[PDB]
Design a protein around this ligand. Structure first.
Ligand SMILES: O=c1[nH]nc(Cl)c2ccccc12
Ligand SMILES: [Zn+2]
Length: 209
């Protein structure tokens, strides 16, 4: 079902996706423990993920949510890092991609900061790092992130001091850091059909000069 189309680095689509990656790196409170130490990426490949059944499943949900929310899907593009990226692009998001222990209950988490999603590429809190070197700051091994279409609908705003259900009458949760003024929002959805893994980004973190 799924096919991957490579974007040309010469294509403005590839460049705006790269731009969204690079411009949303920030420093993290763990000093790089989970995702490694870096200020920018070496982007290796960007692919468009194409799956007609998964897309129809997404837009069918999007229209439902839209209809329930002052005609507004509230659709965003957000990063998602996960060791199960191969399964997500083939079979879609589901409960086995839910972060049981997350701050906003058991759902599927996305971030505005690419560097926040990079923390999850090798597992929760970076797991034990790359499979080859066991290094959470590995500069050699190739990482992948998804840059996804996410339907938020009516989003419950939850300020944070940094499968379950949406709070009644809402279709997601906005987790908004209230202490770190440079940290962008995270978002949690509770139905796999509310996200589509539109781009697959293959990259390395770069060692700071
Ligand atoms: O990109 C992400 N992937 N996985 C998780 Cl649990 C997560 C949790 C918070 C913020 C971002 C992410
Ligand atoms: Zn490695």
């Amino acid at each position: 079902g799924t096919i991957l189309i490579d974007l040309s680095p010469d294509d403005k689509e590839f460049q705006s996706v790269e731009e969204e990656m690079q411009s949303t790196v920030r420093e993290h409170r763990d000093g790089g423990h989970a995702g490694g130490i870096f200020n920018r990426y070496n982007i290796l490949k960007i692919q468009k993920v194409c799956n007609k059944k998964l897309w129809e499943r997404y837009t069918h949900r999007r229209k439902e949510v839209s209809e329930e929310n002052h005609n507004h899907a509230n659709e965003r593009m957000l990063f998602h890092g996960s060791p199960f990226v191969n399964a997500i692009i083939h079979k879609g998001f589901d409960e086995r991609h839910a972060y049981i222990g997350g701050m906003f209950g058991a759902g599927i988490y996305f971030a505005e900061n690419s560097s926040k999603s990079n923390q999850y590429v090798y597992g929760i809190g970076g797991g034990t790092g790359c499979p080859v070197h066991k290094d959470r700051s590995c500069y050699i091994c190739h990482r992948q992130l998804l840059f996804c279409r996410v339907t938020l609908g009516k989003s419950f705003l939850q300020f944070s001091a940094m499968m379950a259900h949406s709070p009644p009458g809402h279709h997601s949760v906005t987790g908004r850091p209230s202490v770190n003024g440079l940290a962008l929002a995270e978002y949690v959805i509770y139905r796999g059909e509310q996200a589509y893994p539109e781009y697959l980004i293959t990259y390395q973190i770069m060692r700071p000069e």
